[PDB]
Design a protein around this ligand. Structure first.
Ligand SMILES: CNCCN1CCC(c2ccc3[nH]c(-c4ccccc4OC)c(Cl)c3c2)CC1
Ligand SMILES: CNCCN1CCC(c2ccc3[nH]c(-c4ccccc4OC)c(Cl)c3c2)CC1
Ligand SMILES: Nc1ncnc2c1ncn2[C@@H]1O[C@H](CSCC[C@H](N)C(=O)O)[C@@H](O)[C@H]1O
Ligand SMILES: Nc1ncnc2c1ncn2[C@@H]1O[C@H](CSCC[C@H](N)C(=O)O)[C@@H](O)[C@H]1O
Lengths: 329, 329
């Protein structure tokens, strides 16, 4: 109650993100054969919506675990839809909650900005080991990370602003373009922004793959997830940096059609958008200009739930360069 | 340079606010007779744009005073437009800067959200006493504050969201409307948001008037500016609270046409928008429902540059009520 408008905004945003909500729904319904008459743990159930989807798919019992005070509204929604015999809202953190039994499946909305910024992944991996039966079902089951060079159209418009002041005002401010450019690009902060698809300058490259079933994924993550990438640009453009984004994949079930929830700018927009990594200044690329490097996602020294990115990159004939970024948390 | 994208964003926003920028421009040009061959002090000159407008209007000398490091770009713009003989950029705070002389006029973009949140008014009043000649020109010369009851259409859409979840998802969340309503309205925070004109439920009432020429305005402000108001509603609606906004007025000059820069939702949008004061829950009003009360704007106990609002109000047959608000700074 004390400042509970944040809780309302989080879940309004989450439910209003139809692509996300429908991805989980269809992901769940497609695993009807694995879920029918079986038991499910919803890690961080929020308003309870995903737990109710599991009931819709035929789960006998769903344990909706929620740490925030939103759990009371989740309970109200469950009973308001007459599912209190099949869905049980359990308040508290998932790492300390007491279930009456192990489960056949886990469902969880755990992904953060850039996948791993302030995410619930460790809670999910903790709850897998503790509560999910051996060979059990994970929804989603995997995650993939992508990187690509971009020309951010919005930034270009912001930088070109100063050279147009003269038109209506008779004061020329073209001289500030360099200052503007160096300020909006020279910072070391990951910018969360929605790109349009035509801002993408090459075929997106996958640099990491997270199999959530693997034991000791938790340890590998602490060392940092990332890898090398290479691509070639489509045509002439001012490159301002890179975008990273993710997808998660739900198992196929009986129909054997795995469902992908993507946050790519080629797929419908989500609240996650994309995470943008700006170079210190623009770089002109050409058709077939080769762009390569290495990217690692890491926990920040200060707060390890905050996302840090080490980028090593090389654009065409330019020397190899590096830049450290972090999310503003 | 260290995190100078904030400086770029402030001034991009400020210049891109065409209504504001053109108001100052025309306000200045209309006082050509008072400014021609005379001297001007631009309090907080930023990119220098207003100082250059004063040159355009015929000022012999303009002293552009700027505390932030943006002063270097202001200097660059002045020389890039060939005005370094008439406009002199002086770095530092206006309260400690050293001018070679008193001035015939002051121009200043000083207004904050809700007029007085983190505003430069005291700097302006300080610089008036210290540097402006007796009887000198103030641009703008006055400010006025308005209040009106509103039905916030955006909030209504946010509150109605939960009752529509069922349509596409088959999970009914109408039960959360009360929780949503109490959370988004029960807080004590001034919300800065742009309203549409049809959200206004009555004739706006002016509750305060600031004559910037008056000595001891600085002392009166510390006691708090405000006053009583009374109005009657136009028709049936769910009232969610009040909006406050301001205008500033430039002297008329030879044409005797004073220019008003308004932040009302009946005039074109500005970056200031309006400051919204929400009731703890909606109240239904009717045609001719009488809404009255008292509003005071104050410095907050913690930070006095942060805006606090005491509201006392009465809607129709309902009892008299009170609510304290503050801007999230
Ligand atoms: C016990 N232990 C459970 C794991 C927990 C934790 C905290 C912060 C974390 N941050 C990350 C992480 C790993 C790779 C990339 C980004 C990450 O978070 C920003 C992990 Cl994994 C991680 C795990 C630390 C406490
Ligand atoms: C010297 N003195 C110069 C004035 C300065 C100051 C600081 C904060 C202030 N806050 C306000 C103020 C007055 C009425 C309503 C809102 C206000 O600011 C939120 C004034 Cl006036 C004001 C003045 C305090 C230090
Ligand atoms: N360790 C933990 N244990 C239980 N809940 C957690 C948690 N960490 C985060 N959460 C909760 O998990 C939710 C993430 S948002 C997901 C909400 C809902 N499942 C949906 O898909 O719409 C939040 O409500 C947050 O409070
Ligand atoms: N005490 C003070 N002395 C000098 N400048 C100040 C000040 N307080 C705030 N400022 C500056 O005043 C500016 C307000 S924004 C106005 C910018 C410009 N005059 C325009 O109209 O577009 C900012 O650049 C801020 O850095």
């Amino acid at each position: 109650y004390y400042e509970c408008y944040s809780d309302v905004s989080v879940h309004e945003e989450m439910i209003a993100d139809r692509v996300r909500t429908d991805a989980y729904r269809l992901g769940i319904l497609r695993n009807w054969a694995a879920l029918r008459g079986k038991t499910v743990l919803d890690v961080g159930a929020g308003t309870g919506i995903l737990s109710i989807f599991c009931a819709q798919a035929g789960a006998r019992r769903v344990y909706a675990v929620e740490a925030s005070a939103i759990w009371q509204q989740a309970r109200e929604v469950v009973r308001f839809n007459g599912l209190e015999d099949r869905v049980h809202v359990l308040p508290g953190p998932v790492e300390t909650v007491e279930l009456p039994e192990q489960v056949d499946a886990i469902v969880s909305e755990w992904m953060g900005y850039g996948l791993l910024h302030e995410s619930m992944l460790s809670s999910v991996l903790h709850a897998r080991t503790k509560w999910l039966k051996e060979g059990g079902l994970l929804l989603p089951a995997s995650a993939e990370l992508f990187i690509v060079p971009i020309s951010d159209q919005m930034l270009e418009w912001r930088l070109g602003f100063w050279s147009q002041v003269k038109q209506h005002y008779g004061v020329d401010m073209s001289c500030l373009e360099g200052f503007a450019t160096r300020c909006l690009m020279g910072h070391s902060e990951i910018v969360v922004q929605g790109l349009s698809g035509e801002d993408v300058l090459a075929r997106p490259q996958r640099f990491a793959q997270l199999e959530l079933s693997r034991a000791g994924l938790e340890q590998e993550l602490e060392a940092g997830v990332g890898g090398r990438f290479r691509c070639s640009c489509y045509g002439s453009a001012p490159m301002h940096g890179f975008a990273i984004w993710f997808q998660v994949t739900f198992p196929g079930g009986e129909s054997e059609k795995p469902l992908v929830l993507s946050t790519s700018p080629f797929h419908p927009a989500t609240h996650w958008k994309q995470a943008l990594l700006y170079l210190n200044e623009p770089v002109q690329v050409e058709q077939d200009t080769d762009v390569s490097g290495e990217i690692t996602l890491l926990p920040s020294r200060d707060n390890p739930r905050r996302l840090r990115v080490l980028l090593r990159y090389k654009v065409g004939d330019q020397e190899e360069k590096t830049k450290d970024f972090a999310m503003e948390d």
